[PDB]
Every structure is written in C-alpha cells, then in structure tokens.
Design a protein around this nucleic acid. Structure first.
Ligand SMILES: C[C@H](CCC(=O)NCCC[N+](C)(C)C[C@H](O)CS(=O)(=O)O)[C@H]1CC[C@H]2[C@@H]3[C@H](O)C[C@@H]4C[C@H](O)CC[C@]4(C)[C@H]3C[C@H](O)[C@]12C
Lengths: 169, 105, 85, 94, 113, 1113
DNA sequence: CTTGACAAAAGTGTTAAATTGTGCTATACTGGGAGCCGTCACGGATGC
C-alpha cells in the first residue's frame, strides 16, 4: 500500500532518473488522484470509529489487582515509599503500552480500513500515542513540579474525562 | 431585485412605527414568490401602502395584471399605531443567484 | 525648559493663563471655556487669543514614544516624509 | 517547472552561471527589441491575447528558449565588453 | 590615544534628528535634540561660570554635569541613572541606542528593510 | 422546537453575577451611595484619611467628607463627543489654625472621577475601556527555603506594591541573622536594639531553638543605647549622609513605621497574623510611640524563621504560587492606589503653599491644587497597561474581557521574569482560575480568566463554593472558601452518585490538598457545587468539553470571543445551559423590569405599561459601531399588547436569539475530504449559505477629518474642490460631506476639504505648462478625505462637531471635525475564517453551487464539508459528538442542553438517533419509496468494513449506520454515492472577526520613513511588507543576489534608484543599476556623531565619497 | 521691427507698534528625592 515513505521514495527515485520537470508533473498527478480518491473513498470520523478494544477492561482490572499487591506490600514494610511510587508508575507505564498494542491489534485484525487506523498507518495524520488517547486511555499525567500523579487518566477521549482527570491533565 | 421605501435612505435604518428594520424587511421580501402569468413579462413593480396597526402580508400588495402572489400569507412587517409603510418592490425574471452587488438595480 | 524656546514675556503669559484656568475650574467645577478664561484674564483678551496662546504652549512630542505594549513601535514609524519627491 | 530546465542546468558547470547567461541575454533582447534573436519565426514564444496570438513580451522566456537551441555562445572573456556592445548595435541598430 | 577624549562634539545632521510638524499640527522631534540641548546648555553655562571666576566647587559640579551630558548623548543609561524627558520615565534614545539592539539601525534598517 | 435537557447534577446555587468582579469592587471603592458618616475606611475614603490631616506645623488641613456629583454628560453623549464619563469630586476640607484656634471650612472641587457603567466598563475619552484585574504575590510574611544552602530558610516580608521595601531575614553561614533592605545587607541584631530589645529578652523568646539565638548576640550593639543604634543603623542605610538624630529617626520611621509610606495592606496584615500567630494593631512593621520604636512583626517573623530552621512541628515553607498566597487587585483597588498617589502629590503641593505663608487669608481652596490628583487618575485610565481598549466584537467578548486576570502590568511581572512557575496551572487554580482559557503564545499562563463560580473577596483572594457534607449526606449549605482554607478538608467530586441527598457510592473520588484520593463517604467533608466551577464562562460554553483535548479546548474558548454578530444569528443546537446567563449578564439585551403589558413596539424603542401604571420607554441601540467595528443593534422581540413577566426578554441584543447566546449558525456538516479544498484545515461551504444570508455580518467603519487653522489660511470643508469634475462630487451635499445612503467605493470622496498651498515658486516646466493653457493657479489644493483601497460601503451617519459646541472640547487650532460612518453588509467569502467551539478552525477555500455539494438521498445538500483529518491529531472528539447529536436534532426538530462533564452520553445520543431514523427513513416508506440501488452498494461496502451486521435487511443496516451518525451520501457532481457512509450532522459554526477583506493589502510605491527613507509599515499607512533578516537569509541561501540587492536598494531606500526604477518601468525600460542605500548613509553619519571616522575605500585604499560631494567642505 | 505711452508689480527707505531680551526686586530663609527588585545563564573581569 502506498504510504508516506513509499511515496517519498518514489518522488526521490523519479527525481534521480527523470529530473525536476518530470518529477513536478508526477507530483501534480499524485496530488490530483490522491484528492480525487479521498473524496469518493468514504473517509469520515464518527465516535464509533474510535473503537475501544475489549482488552482495556481486562488490563485495567489486572492493573487494579496488581495495584493492590503493591499497596499490600507497602503496609508490610517490604518496600519503601519511593519503591511504591516507582512500582505504580512502572505498572501503569506497562499497562498503557499494552493498551496501545491492543488498540492497533484490534484495528489490524478487525477494522483494517478504520479511519483512524488508515490515517496513522498511511502517515496522513496521527501517531499511535494520539490514537491511544482516543481509543484507549490517556494514562499517566505529570504535576507542575514534574512528579507523576499516582492515579492515571483511565478514560479516553471517546468515553470522556471526569472533571478531576481533565484538571489533572 | 430592488426595494424602495419612502423616507428610507439605506437598508441599515429603522422605520418609525415598524417593528422590523429594513434588513429584516428585505429578508422577508427575499422569500416573496411571484408568478408571472405572461411569458413576455420581464419586470414588474409591486406597490404596498399600509398604515398601522396591522400585520402587513404579501397579500397587501396592490394587484397587478398577469402577476400572482404564490404566498399571500408571507409576513412582511409589523406596523404599530402611527406607523406607515409605502414600498415599491421590483420583481425581475432571471436565472441563478445574482447578488445585489452585481446587478445593483 | 522647552525644546522650542519661548520668550519670557510669553512664558509668563502661559503661566498666567494656566493659573487663571486653574482658579476658574475650582469656582466652576468644570473645565472653563476659552471665553470664560479670556474674561478672567482682563482687557485685550478674547477666546481667539486664548486658543492661540494655548496652541503656542504645546510642547513637541517625541518620535521615540512607544506604541503598544512592546517597545517595538514608535511615533516616527507612522510619520511619512513629505519633503523628498 | 520551466521547459527544459534539466537541459538548461546540464549545459553549465554552476547553476548560477545559467541565471547570469539568461538574464544577460534577456537584457540584450530587450535592448534591441528582440531583433537580435536567434530563434526562427516559428520558434518565437507566443502570447494568447484577446486580440490574437502575439509575441511573448517576457525576455527571460525568450532567453531560456534561445539557450535550449544551442545557437548562443556563453563564457568568460569571450569578447571585450565595449566591442560587444558596439558591434551588436551595428548589426541591430534598433 | 588622546582622541578618546572629546574636545569638539560632532552634531548629527538635522534631518536624521528631525523636528517635523504632523498633519494634526503638533511638532514631533527626536530625543537626540533634547540630549543635544542639555549639552549645549551645560557647556554654555560653564563658559559663563568660568568667565565670572566662579569657585572651584561650582566649576567642578558643572564640569561633572558636562561629562554626564556627553555620556547621555552618546550612551544614555550606560553610567548612572538614564536621562528622561520631564513628564515621563522613558529614557531618551541616545546614539548608542539607535545603532544597537533588535530595534537598532543594523537589525531594523540594514540587515532587513 | 423543544429543548431536551441532559444532566444529573443539581446545582444548589446559580452562577454569581459574571461582572461582579468589576461592578462590586468599584462600588466599594467609590462608596458614592452610602452617607459620609457611615463610610467604612476603604477605597478612596481610606485614601483621604491616610493623606489627611496635612499638618505642615501651625496650619493643619483636615479632611471631613467627600461627595460625588452627577455626571455632567450622559454615556451616549460622552461617546459621541469623545468625553470621559465621570463624576465631579468634592471634598469638604477644613483649615485649622493651631495658634489662633480658628477653623475655616469649605468644599473644594478635586476634579472628576470616571464612572463605571452598568455592564462594568468605562468611557475614557469617548472610548469604552475595561480595567483588567491584576494578580500578584500577596503581601505578608513568607518563608522560602534557600536554594544555595540546603536546610536554610529565608524570611520575606512583602508590603503592598510600591508601599514599602521588601525585607529579607536570613541566617548567614557565620551565624548572624542578616536583614536586607534596599539591596543593603546589615545585621538584624542592630535593628532589634533600635526597636527596644534586650539580650535577656531575645534569649527568653528565641533561646529555645538550638544555638541559632547565639548568632543574634552582638555585645557591641547591646552596649549602645537604642538611640545610638538608631544612628548606627542610619549610617549603614545611608552612608555619607550627616547622621543627625532628627534626620536618622525620620528615615527609620519612614522605612518600617510610617503608615503613609509603609502599608502592609489588609490582606498582608491578615496573612501575617494567620501565619505568625499574632495580632497586628496596624499595617506597619513597627510603631513609633512615646518617642521610641516598638516592634510589631520582626520578633514573630524571626521566631518562626528559627522554629522553621529548627524543624519544630507546625512550621512549614510557603508556596508563593499557591493561590492563597496570590491575590487579585480589582478595578477598585487599582483606581484607589492611583488615587492615593495623586492625593499624595496634592498633599505635597499643599505643604509648600503652607510654607509660602500669607496665612492671614489662606483658604483650603487656595492651598489645594487638584491637578496632580486629576493627572494621576487620567494617567491610570488612559496609559495604564491594565486599562485596555474594550473588546466588544460580541457581548461574550466584553464579558470575558471584564473577567480577565493579568500577571503583567504596573507593579507586575514581565515576560523576561515570567518563568514556568508563574505560567503553570497550580493545583489551587481549581475552581478559581480556568485551567484552559489562556492566550497561546508568549502570554500563555500570564493572562487567565476567573472561574465561572469563583469570586474575589475583600482581601483579594479568590474563593470557590463548596457544598458542606456531614454524616455522609450532602446539604445545601454552600461555603465560599479560599485556597488555604480548602487545603484543610477532603472535598468530593460533584459527579459523586447521590441517593437523594446522601452519598450512595462506597468509594468517593475526592481531593486532599489538590491530590486525587479515594475515600469513604464518612470521610467527605465538602462537595464540589458543579463541574462548571472549574472552568471559565467561555470554556463552559463548549459542549462535550470532556471529549476534547485541553490544547484544542483553549482554541475553542478563545475563538468564541472573536465571533462576529450575524444578521440571522442562531443559538447552537447543542448547548451547555449557560447561553441565557451570558446574554442576561452582558446587559446587551433588554428585559422587563417587572410584570406589565407592552404598549409600543418599534425598531427604535419599546414602551411597556407596568402593573404599577408607570410608562417606561426603552430606547433601542440600533446599528451602533463597536470598538472592533461590528454593528451592535437591539431588535425587539415583543408585540404591542403582549403581557410580559418580570425578567422576560424585550429585545435581543447583538449575537443573541430569543435571549440565548447566538455566536454563529447551525449548518448541515459532512465530515469528509473533498477534492483537496479541505486540505490542511481549509473549509468547503455551499453557496446556499449566501443565498439565505447565513454568516452575513454588518460592519461599520468610522472616518474622521479635521478642518484646521493654518498660518497661510484655515482649511475649509466645502464642496468646491478644485480640478474635480461633477462625477467626483456627485454624492457630496452643499456642505461638502457625502450624503447619507450613498454608496462609496475606494477613491470616492467622503468629505471635501481645501487647504491653502504653501508658498513656493513652481518648477519652470509647470510655469510654461500653465502659461500655455491660460489657467491661473489657485490658492487651495485637494486635501479631501477619500475611501481607502479595499474599503467602502453605505454612508449611514455623519457627525459634525464644531468649535464652541456644548461639550465639544476640540484641540486648539481645529475649527471643526467631521466623522462619517460607512456600513457594509459582509457575506461569507473565500478567505474568511470559520470555527466551531471545539478548536476546529479554518478559512473558506471554496464556495460550491448547491448542485455540486454532497446531498442526502432525500435531496438535502450539506452546508459545510470538514476534513476528517483535522480530528485525530487534535483529539477534539466533542465536535463529532456535537455532530451526532445535531444529526438527531435536525430530524427530530429539537435542540439540546448537555452540560459539561454531566450531559448527553453515547447511549442516550444513539437512542435519539434511533428516533431520528424513524422520521429520516420511515417518512420515505410512507411516500412509496424503498431502498436505493446506490444505498445497497454502499451497504455492501459497509459490511466489508465491519460497519453493519451481515445478513440484516437494508433498512436495518441503514439504521445501524444512522446510530453511528453516518448516512449514505450522494455526490452532487456524479450522482454516484460516496463509497463509504459519511458522518453527517448539524453543527454550530462561528464566523470569526479575522476577515480577508480587512487583511488583504498591496503597495507598489507609497509613503516613506523620515529618517531611513524606507517604506512605512501597515495597511492603514499603505505600507510595504517587512523583509527581515530571515527573509534576507532565504535569498542568500538561494543565491538570488540581484533579487536581494533590489529589495535592499531599489525597492526600499535607494532614493535615486527607486525614482529611476519607477521611471524606467513606466517607459517600458529595465530598471537601472542600484546604488548605495540611504540607511547606510544614515549609519555612517550616526557613526560620525559618535566621533568615529568611518570611511569607504576603493581597491587602492583611497577614500570614496558616497555623499556625492554634498558633505565635503 | 522701435517708441512712446500707460497701471500696475516690485523694490526701498522710514517710522511706527509689536515683539523680544534684560535687569531687578533688601525680614529671614543655608545638604533631595523617589524608590523600595518573582529570571536565567553567559562571559569577563576583579579583586580576596
Ligand atoms: C496519458 C494521457 C494522454 C493520452 C494521449 O495523448 N495519447 C493524458 C493526456 C491528458 C492527461 C490528464 C490531464 O493532464 C489532466 C490531469 C493532470 C494530472 O497531472 C494527472 C491526471 C490528469 C487527468 C491527466 C491524466 C493523463 O496523464 C492524461 C489523460
């Protein structure tokens, strides 16, 4: 499939073999057909296009269970205050990455022509980090001092943030 | 295509005894539907002379031969006691959308 | 004290006019008009002379006066040269 | 892109030499009213005007197309500047 | 090396420090004229003080004021409190200020136009 | 059209008056209505009581009372005549002869106090202005840790701004505590000796904190008396100054003990007592009584500093960005502060007049010169950074401006001193300052907005309301409480589930000192009133705010301020519930004072017969020009004989629809790329918008000209302009002014003016030319006012103010001034900026005919085409949800109120879409139409994309697409359907004040600068574009040497070159070789003025003259 | 082509009022005034 990198390599190869004048004509041809097909393709953005994977609920419940494990070990003296803080951040960092993989795995196997997935894969608009905030969770937030809040933003932009989460972000 | 109102110089004014300003009256006149019963008729002028208190409608224009108002109940202006509305509305025949800045009639 | 020098006889005239206007303001509770100032000055004074004297007393404005909240725009940037063709 | 821009760049060692040659030729063409052109009458650049097809007024367009034909000679220290101007006026009094 | 001390102070041409009447009727002038007037007033007063045989304390104060007037004309605010026109706290734009900075002559009128 | 309201949170209290930050503070400062004997010691009353009595000593000028008179002119007349809406100020002053014992009392006129209008603004020189509230560090005593020395703390004593020096107490590494005053560091031990402290006393009070008291032990200064230490202290503070006792005591008294010179402030005094656990008698660091200095705050400050350094419990450092440590100076305090400064200047002039003498016939009127007070007040309302030209593009614009909070301004911060700490959203901004509304760019975090429910208290601290929670049940008791008081409680979120008034959820999301925690209901002590208190008014107008990224929500809230009023302005289909309150609190609309019946309705005025029987006539503001040029008019919304209740709408104001805020239009939007005209935020609209006059706005431009007295003769405003034909003078009346109702185009004359030509002999070519034609040159020339390029319209108003007119204060030498108002009706065109409330903005790049737009199967074309590529990166999903809800409301014929964070959710939007489908598609079935062949093809692709369930009927699959907000959409160009279903819905889009009509500019040649001889700048001055250094860099990188040289010389400041270039071009010739720029000649001459010999040399080092021999003697 | 003739138009020498510059006020008076410090790192010098 013709994406940003393959089209860029095509333009560079045409420049080497054919010169500026022919490359400029090729660029206008790509622009014309790219605009023509994007209009008739049926590319739009609905709220359901931000598909929520079913693994997000599993990961959040799993993260909550391991969050209790950290707090249980905190009360037993096995780990210090800074150890508890680092353990929570690592747990949510790993959970955030798994949700990102679940979002794109859900698109890859079930909605290969999903608008957000197609824009991100083709290089038109968006990156996996921004797609995760729309379909997964926004994740950990930082205080103005630079310290990370212990509780992440568990909601995506589809579900809608709470008042506190919006202020934390 | 053009409207003349007595004692009115431009469309950015208000008329004493009339609730609507000239802009709103022109907006109401843009919804006037006029049917020419004569295929050779190209331009007609409709005369309206009203005195308050009344709700002047499209049926209050003076009758013109080979001219029929298709929406007589169209609201034009609201006249208060002591208010008068003497209008000369010109209706032309044409195609497409011609902004006033182009024809300038 | 003035970039455009004014003779002492006219400086004292400006000082007297300013004092007279100040005293009339406290009596009237408002800015006096040129006729009211001229009447208080005495004989030989009309509103035309008061206006001319006040026009004379106007100090020149600086070309480097800032315009806006940033010191990047000045009065001289908006004055066209009208001498060179 | 300008017509034959790849060929124009290939005829000079430095791309800015091409601009100097084109600009100097254009002023030669403007100075003599395009009477010093090396273009054949069927090769003259044309303007589509409401009054008909006329010659292209842009001398830069003329200069670029003249260089594509190969009938122009460019270089450094080809002829003295004074002798070049005087001789070209003799051939094209304009 | 003694040329680093000024005996004659150059005066900028008047069109580069214009006094112009605006369309309204009021006059507009550059800060350099006020800086020049202060130097001339202090220099002229020193000449009269010297002619009157004033005590050294008065002469010393005038000479120190003359040095500061020259400094304000060349570089206002470089040494001591910046010189400002009456009725405002704006420092007068000196010759150094005109040439230096982002609003100076180099970066506002020579490197870009 | 019904309005369906979403939301579960019940707001116990309504929004406070949105302008009370302006209105209440200025009323408190003026105290105009309270009788003088009951005036409290605040505002300008406090200013009088602080400066008076002016005891020169023996004449004493005492202040008894002041009063404010009625304004000389009404608000409308002040605007027309460029007058300040102000009230005369009179002070009843008494002069007391201490020797004779005689009192002379009279009322002196102190000048004019500008008056705030009802909406909360001022009219300064005929212009509407808003005084922006200022945020700064609150006065008091603060304890911050030393960054250089770990474990060490410094004590800061901050008074009111420009009301005393900052005091720093620090334990030096050697041990002695140092006091830093006016950049001078001296040992604090010496000061306490002056303030009467013994060695035993210091050991008793502060000897219980380690050995730190040992550093507060200098045997040299305890040996000397307090009077000797006072002189010793005076020498350190003012070295060289003769240390006389009377001079020394006056300096120390004026440094820490003079109320007229040191003022800790009511907020500062309160903060000092709360932190140090003491009780201040006044607002000074010390008190001078019985000929000696008594300490008031230094001992508690040093005691806390040692206790904090010793690590004792209960002592903590102070967060200076904590909003309990940052206060707001409102318009009342800012005006009062400048009023005090002017009064101090007036008091100083009273003393010198008392020094002059003539006490035999001295009256208080003679001693008082009000000009220093008037000048200070005039300077504050005219040339202050916080005094700003009122933004009134739409009524919401003025509301936001009056709630703006600025960290800049006099006594404020600068962007150089503004680090990340001041600009960040502190945790205490919650409920007090909006975490979203801020200007993006260099001013981010420096200008903010008051939160919707927030209010500034008497001390200047922002308080936010909370609901008291006791025993796990939420009461209706609302407590407005500061950030420092908020830190003491566990405050639950407003979304916490409630069973009646009792908290139903076992786990409650709460905040403890700003941190999110999960607590039991019994641990909850307060509750948030509503989600709306977190955000400002503009942010609260963004529906589905919870679905938008904060960076794009910032853009949406800011651009609502830029929306122009529309002649057919509509309230949004999806609202948040604050649209009515914004219009009501802006005072732009008209409402019935009480119950009554409307007697007369007209476009000019409304007369209502109230129940009590009195006739009240309300004149309607019609076609008024705002500060930004947008037309502000009030259109009546009642008929004659209609009964109105108290508060019922009488006339809609600008940008309002039936009392609801109407900043734009409701248009049918298709979210889909369209042939590259949607590229990079560009917007495609239909021509049908122009046909029905949506996004059509009225703009009024003001043109001014003055007829002046000139030495060669006065300028005459007349119709007789020399050398002009009848065509050019056709629209001018006999007075020379353009007639009302005339259409004016660029180059047309608005008003004719002739000016006497300066005496100068003509060029000989002109002398021969005039002689051939036999025409004698006239004495006057054309100086008439003409329409600038790219402007024009319809003349609607001409204002002529003449010298001697009542209230017209023309400048000397000006005989008359003529002002012409030109109104233009602006339709939407290519280049005009459109935006929605979610930060999606773009310019119209293409206007299509109706038959080219995508259309529904029922034939309805969409109005606006938006690129779906603008959504994913911006992460503002609220527009999509608005589009889905708008699609349901478009077919159900209803509007929606979805409050932010508590409103319409996806399940409830979809069930609205299910009902909207039954009228969307069920109407088709009744008309005798099945499923389109084109729809069947799209449904076939839809199931391959996983959008519809395979095996269902086409009707069911179309319903499934509809529940996702998508419809089958047909291409108007081809008739074939778009291969995939397209999100189509109704969305509220605003037309912004940035219009290509006002921004397009071009210049070939024009005015040049006086000194540099370079083209001026700005479209208004017909200036040229700035070719700065970076643009010069670009040409250098291109190797375009000759292009660069032209811009440097031929097109900017080569006077000979630019004249020869223009002459060559108009002759058909090529421009000549450029020459030296005139700015380089200026540079050389200015370098010579610095006594620098700058010379241009040739190949042979010989001097080269670039001045053409014009400067060589 | 000159040559008179005119009524200005322009130059010019007085004379007056208007304007401008200068001196002078005699109880005794004897060291100012406004500020008043929320940024940062960078050289470079200037001395402990
Ligand atoms: C191959 C075909 C010529 C056939 C022939 O002459 N024998 C040429 C002649 C005209 C060309 C089109 C136009 O340029 C418009 C447009 C330009 C864009 O750049 C690319 C798309 C378009 C549609 C082009 C496609 C293609 O390139 C055409 C059909």
């Amino acid at each position: 499939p013709q994406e940003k990198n393959s089209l860029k390599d095509l333009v560079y190869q045409a420049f080497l073999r054919l010169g500026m004048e022919k490359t400029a004509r090729l660029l206008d041809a790509l622009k014309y057909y790219g605009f023509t097909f994007s209009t008739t393709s049926g590319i739009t953005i609905g709220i359901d296009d931000a598909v929520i994977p079913e693994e997000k609920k599993q990961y959040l419940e799993e993260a909550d269970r391991k969050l209790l494990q950290i707090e249980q070990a905190y009360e037993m003296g096995f780990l210090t205050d800074r150890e508890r803080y680092d353990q929570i951040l690592q747990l949510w960092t790993e959970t955030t990455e798994k949700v990102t993989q679940a979002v794109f795995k859900n698109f890859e196997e079930n909605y290969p022509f999903n608008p957000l997935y197609v824009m991100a894969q083709s290089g038109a608009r968006g990156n996996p980090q921004q797609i995760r905030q729309l379909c997964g969770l926004r994740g950990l937030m930082q205080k103005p001092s630079g310290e990370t809040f212990e509780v992440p933003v568990r909601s995506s932009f589809r579900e809608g943030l709470t008042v506190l989460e919006y202020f934390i972000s | 295509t053009s409207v003349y109102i007595e004692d009115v110089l431009h469309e950015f004014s208000t008329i004493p005894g009339v609730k609507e300003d000239v802009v709103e009256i022109i907006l109401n006149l843009k919804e006037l539907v006029v049917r020419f019963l004569n295929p050779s008729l190209q331009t007609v002028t409709l005369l309206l002379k009203a005195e308050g208190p009344k709700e002047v409608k499209a049926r209050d224009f003076l009758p013109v031969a080979d001219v029929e108002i298709m929406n007589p109940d169209l609201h034009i202006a609201t006249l208060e006691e002591g208010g008068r509305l003497n209008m000369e509305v010109r209706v032309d025949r044409g195609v497409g959308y011609v902004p006033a800045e182009k024809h300038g009639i | 004290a003035r970039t455009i020098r004014i003779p002492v006889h006219m400086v004292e005239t400006i000082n007297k006019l300013s004092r007279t206007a100040r005293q009339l303001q406290q009596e009237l509770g408002r800015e006096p008009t040129y006729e009211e100032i001229a009447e208080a000055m005495g004989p030989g004074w009309d509103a035309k002379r008061v206006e001319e004297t006040l026009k004379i007393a106007q100090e020149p404005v600086s070309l480097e006066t800032p315009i806006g909240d940033e010191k990047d725009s000045f009065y001289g940037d908006f004055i066209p040269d009208e001498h060179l063709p | 892109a300008e017509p034959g821009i790849d060929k124009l760049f290939g005829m000079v060692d430095s791309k800015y030499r091409l601009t100097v040659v084109v600009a100097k030729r254009a002023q030669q063409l403007l100075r003599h009213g395009f009477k010093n052109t090396v273009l054949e009458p069927e090769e003259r650049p044309k303007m589509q005007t409401l009054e008909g097809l006329f010659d292209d007024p842009n001398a830069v367009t003329w200069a670029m197309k003249e260089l594509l034909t190969g009938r122009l000679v460019f270089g450094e220290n080809l002829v003295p500047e004074d002798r070049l101007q005087k001789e070209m006026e003799r051939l094209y009094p304009v | 090396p003694e040329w680093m001390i000024l005996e004659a102070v150059p005066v900028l041409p008047p069109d580069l420090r214009p006094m112009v009447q605006v369309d309204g009727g009021r006059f507009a002038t550059s800060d350099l004229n006020d800086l020049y007037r202060r130097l001339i007033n202090r220099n002229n007063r020193l000449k009269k003080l010297l002619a009157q045989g004033a005590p050294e304390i008065i002469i010393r104060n005038e000479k120190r004021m003359l040095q500061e007037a020259v400094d304000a004309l060349l570089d206002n605010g470089r040494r001591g409190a910046p010189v400002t026109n009456p009725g405002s706290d704006r420092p007068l734009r000196s010759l150094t200020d005109i040439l230096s900075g982002k609003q100076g002559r180099f970066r506002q009128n020579l490197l870009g136009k | 059209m019904e309005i369906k309201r979403f939301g579960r949170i019940r707001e116990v209290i309504p929004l406070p008056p949105l302008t009370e930050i302006q209105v209440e503070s200025y009323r408190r400062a003026l105290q105009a209505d309270v009788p003088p004997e009951k005036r409290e010691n605040v505002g300008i009353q406090a200013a009088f009581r602080e400066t008076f009595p002016i005891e020169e000593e023996g004449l004493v000028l005492d202040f008894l009372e002041y009063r404010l008179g009625e304004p000389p002119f009404p608000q409308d007349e002040c605007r027309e005549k460029d007058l300040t809406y102000q009230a005369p100020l009179y002070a009843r002053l008494q002069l007391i002869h201490k020797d004779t014992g005689l009192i002379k009392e009279d009322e002196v006129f102190l000048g004019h106090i500008p008056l705030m209008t009802e909406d909360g603004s001022f009219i300064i020189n005929g212009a509407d202005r808003v005084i922006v509230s200022q945020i700064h560090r609150s006065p008091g005593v603060y304890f911050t840790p030393d960054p250089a020395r770990p474990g060490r703390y410094i004590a800061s004593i901050i008074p009111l701004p420009k009301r005393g020096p900052w005091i720093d107490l620090e334990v030096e590494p050697n041990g002695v505590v140092s006091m830093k005053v006016n950049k001078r560091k001296f040992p604090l031990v010496l000061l306490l000796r002056v303030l009467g402290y013994d060695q035993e006393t210091l050991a008793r009070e502060l000897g219980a904190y380690g050995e730190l008291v040992q550093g507060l032990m200098d045997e040299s200064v305890f040996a000397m008396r307090p009077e000797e230490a006072l002189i010793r202290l005076f020498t350190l503070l003012r070295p060289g100054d003769p240390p006389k006792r009377d001079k020394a005591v006056a300096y120390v008294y004026g440094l820490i003990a003079d109320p007229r010179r040191y003022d800790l402030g009511e907020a500062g005094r309160y903060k000092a007592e709360e932190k140090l656990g003491i009780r201040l008698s006044g607002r000074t660091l010390a008190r001078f009584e019985d000929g000696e200095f008594k300490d008031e705050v230094f001992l508690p400050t040093l005691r806390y500093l040692f206790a904090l350094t010793a690590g004792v419990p209960g002592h903590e450092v102070d967060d200076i960005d904590h909003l309990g440590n940052r206060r707001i100076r409102t318009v009342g305090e800012l005006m009062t502060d400048q009023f005090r400064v002017g009064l101090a200047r007036l008091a100083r002039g009273v003393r010198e007049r008392m020094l002059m003498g003539s006490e035999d016939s001295l009256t208080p009127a003679k001693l008082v010169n009000s000009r220093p007070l008037e000048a200070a007040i005039r300077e504050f309302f005219s040339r202050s950074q916080l005094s700003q030209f009122k933004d009134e593009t739409n009524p919401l614009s003025s509301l936001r401006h009056k709630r703006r909070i600025s960290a800049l301004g006099p006594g404020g911060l600068t962007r150089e001193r503004a680090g990340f700490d001041v600009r960040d959203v502190h945790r205490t901004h919650y409920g007090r300052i909006c975490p979203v509304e801020t200007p993006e760019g260099a001013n981010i975090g420096l200008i903010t907005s008051l939160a919707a429910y927030a209010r500034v208290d008497e001390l200047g601290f922002i308080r936010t309301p909370y609901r008291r929670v006791v025993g796990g049940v939420v009461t209706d008791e609302v407590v407005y409480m500061t950030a420092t008081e908020e830190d003491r409680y566990t405050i639950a979120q407003a979304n916490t589930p409630l069973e009646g008034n009792r908290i139903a959820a076992e786990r409650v999301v709460a905040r403890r000192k700003g941190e999110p925690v999960i607590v039991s209901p019994e641990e909850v002590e307060f509750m948030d009133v509503s989600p709306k208190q977190v955000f400002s008014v503009n942010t609260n107008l963004i529906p589905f705010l919870e679905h938008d990224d904060a960076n794009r929500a910032l853009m949406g809230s800011n651009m609502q301020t830029q929306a122009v009023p529309l002649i057919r302005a509509q309230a949004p289909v999806v609202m948040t519930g604050l649209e009515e309150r914004v219009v009501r609190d802006s005072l732009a609309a008209l409402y019935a004072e009480e119950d009554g019946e409307v007697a007369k309705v007209d476009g000019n005025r409304i007369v209502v017969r109230y129940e009590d029987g009195r006739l009240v006539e309300y004149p309607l503001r019609r076609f008024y020009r705002s500060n930004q040029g947008t037309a502000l008019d009030q259109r009546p919304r009642v008929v004659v004989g209609q009964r109105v209740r108290k508060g019922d709408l009488l006339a809609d104001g600008p940008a309002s629809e039936n009392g609801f805020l109407a900043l734009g239009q409701n248009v049918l939007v298709a979210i889909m790329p369209f042939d590259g005209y949607n590229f990079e935020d560009a917007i495609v609209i239909s021509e049908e918008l122009l046909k029905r006059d949506f996004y059509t706005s009225i703009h009024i431009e003001r043109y001014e000209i003055e007829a002046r007295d000139t030495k060669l003769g006065p300028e005459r405003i007349t119709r007789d302009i020399p050398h002009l034909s009848e065509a050019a003078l056709r629209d001018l009346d006999e007075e020379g002014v353009v007639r009302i109702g005339a259409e004016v185009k660029p180059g047309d004359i608005l008003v004719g003016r002739t000016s006497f030509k300066g005496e100068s002999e003509p060029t000989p070519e002109e002398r021969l030319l005039r002689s051939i034609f036999g025409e004698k040159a006239r004495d006057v020339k054309d100086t008439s006012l003409r329409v600038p390029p790219g402007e024009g319209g319809i003349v609607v108003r001409t204002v002529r103010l003449r010298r001697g007119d009542p209230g017209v204060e023309l400048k000397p030498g000006v005989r008359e001034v003529v002002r012409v108002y030109v109104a233009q009706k602006r339709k939407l065109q290519v280049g005009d900026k459109l935006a929605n409330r979610h930060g999606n903005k773009g310019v119209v790049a293409k206007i299509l005919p109706v038959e080219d737009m995508p259309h529904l199967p029922d034939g309805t074309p969409v109005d606006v085409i938006l690129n779906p590529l603008g959504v994913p990166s911006r992460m503002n999903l609220g527009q999509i949800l608005e589009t889905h809800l708008g699609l349901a409301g478009y077919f159900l014929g209803q509007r929606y109120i979805s409050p932010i964070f508590d409103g319409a959710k996806e399940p409830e939007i979809k069930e609205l879409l299910a009902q909207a489908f039954e009228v969307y598609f069920g109407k088709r079935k009744g008309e005798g139409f099945g499923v389109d062949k084109r729809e069947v093809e799209v449904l076939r692709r839809a199931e391959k994309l996983g959008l519809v369930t395979p095996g269902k009927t086409p009707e069911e699959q179309l319903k499934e697409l509809f529940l996702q907000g998508k419809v089958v959409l047909y291409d108007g160009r081809t008739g074939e359907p778009i291969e995939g279903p397209i999100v189509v819905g109704q969305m509220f889009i605003m037309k912004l004040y940035h219009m290509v009509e006002d921004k397009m500019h071009a210049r070939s040649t024009g005015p040049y600068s006086l000194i540099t001889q370079q083209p001026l700048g700005g479209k208004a001055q017909f200036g040229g574009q700035r070719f700065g250094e970076m643009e010069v860099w670009a040409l250098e990188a291109y190797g375009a040497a000759h292009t660069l040289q032209e811009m440097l010389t031929l097109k900017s400041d080569d006077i000979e070159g630019r004249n020869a270039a223009y002459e060559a071009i108009i002759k058909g010739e090529d421009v000549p070789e450029p020459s030296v720029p005139e700015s380089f000649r200026v540079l050389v001459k200015e370098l010579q003025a610095l006594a620098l010999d700058v010379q241009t040399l040739d190949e042979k080092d010989n001097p080269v003259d670039i001045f053409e021999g014009l400067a060589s003697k």
